[PDB]
Design a protein around this ligand. Structure first.
Ligand SMILES: *Nc1nc(C)c(O)c(C=O)c1COP(=O)(O)O
Ligand SMILES: *Nc1nc(C)c(O)c(C=O)c1COP(=O)(O)O
Ligand code: NI
Ligand code: NI
Lengths: 233, 233
């Protein structure tokens, strides 16, 4: 009401980024978001990046430890040691995902004015439930995986009607929705199906591309391409 | 005495490294050092690697924020935000160096038999006091600097009486020692002379490089020349 300076938070969030201190950066944007004000494209970018870094570092640590755990199964204490370290990391992963999901469902998504940013948050929602999914105990895994799917799906509809096939975010949605299908629902089928499509529909309008993102669209289109054959191969 | 196994901590430390969680890694190696045993060659590497990464990130952020704390000034408001963020980072930085300095002065240096490690720890000592010197205030800055120089100085002796001009640790000692004179005591004079002399003495016996550390010896020499080069203008 007078206790928060939403503008200084953004500067500080921007300062934490330069300093490569993303936990701090994420802490500032979470706080900017809770002020209830619909985010500007720069702020949305600052939020996405911060949390991308914060959650991403853990997802990468998890994988490394998730491996060492297996490839060191023979022994007990050792493997057993790696298992606890992994659980320590999953607790961190969850706290991060519950927070982004909470901001996403209570502040961002409901106040998305434009369709472009609505799809973007819906996509984030899909990504973060997916992160919870990758580390959920079989019992809760079903419900979670479903949260992800329906979030991506809802973003996929909105995009398939308000956004051009070449728009970076729509393409980005297809990129991760397709990954969700290959890595989560372990369905190389539905996967490839979506990644190839979204790619053609982009090509069909390669001229609809703009210098405003011709470098971004194709960039993601290369990732869609790379993954695509990476699976067929 | 039965509450913590040194070997399991080391494995904990290596696991953390693989997952690139250096703070966890440093905490493990700190525990290993406190176990009271002179460190092995592997354990020493794990310690310096971990702390180099932990303090490195802070020094790095300290600079990014300090430099931005300047490009401001005119904005007393933003300047305060920057300044406080700098102090926060300083407190972290200062805590890390304090711990390392404590480990070195209490457990490591005192129980360093082989003249190699002793020089390595004595050097680490000069380095960490140097890090403190960079963020110290005029008041106590002198004494701190006085601590950096003394630690390097004695390390410089033992080396130039036990290590060849080509041994990596001796070369490294000369590099940071020369970086201290230039960056800290502000005098490229004694800085270049020390760097250039550590280099000339290297090549003099150039064909003394062992396949085991020629690349290592080489990397230190390039830096010595590059730094020296930059000090030549
Ligand atoms: N989702 C997404 N959107 C945009 C605009 C991109 O350029 C890219 C890739 O560069 C992606 C895929 O993003 P990640 O969530 O995997 O970082
Ligand atoms: N001091 C030092 N020693 C050794 C054995 C090295 O290989 C290197 C460089 O890789 C150095 C310089 O180390 P920093 O204190 O700048 O990380
Ligand atoms: Ni207020
Ligand atoms: Ni014990």
């Amino acid at each position: 009401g007078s206790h928060m300076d939403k503008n200084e938070l953004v500067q500080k969030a921007k300062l934490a980024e330069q300093a490569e201190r993303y936990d701090d950066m994420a802490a500032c944007m979470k706080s900017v978001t809770e002020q209830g004000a619909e985010l500007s494209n720069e702020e949305r970018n600052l939020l996405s990046v911060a949390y991308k870094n914060v959650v991403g570092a853990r997802r990468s640590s998890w994988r490394v430890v998730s491996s060492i755990e297996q490839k060191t199964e023979g022994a007990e204490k050792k493997q057993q040691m790696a298992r606890e370290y992994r659980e320590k990391i999953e607790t961190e992963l969850r706290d991060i995902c519950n927070d982004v999901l909470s901001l996403l469902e209570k502040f961002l998504i409901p106040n998305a004015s434009q369709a472009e940013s609505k799809v973007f948050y819906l996509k984030m929602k899909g990504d973060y439930y997916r992160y919870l999914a990758e580390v959920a105990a079989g019992d809760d895994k079903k419900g979670i995986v479903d949260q992800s799917q329906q979030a991506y799906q809802e973003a996929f509809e909105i995009s398939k009607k308000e956004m051009q096939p070449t728009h970076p975010i729509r393409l980005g949605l297809a990129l991760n929705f397709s990954v969700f299908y290959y890595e989560i629902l372990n369905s190389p089928e539905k996967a490839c199906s979506l990644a190839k499509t979204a790619f053609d529909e982009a090509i069909a309008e390669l001229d609809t591309l703009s210098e405003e993102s011709y470098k971004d669209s194709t960039l993601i289109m290369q990732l869609l391409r790379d993954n695509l054959t990476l699976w067929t191969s």
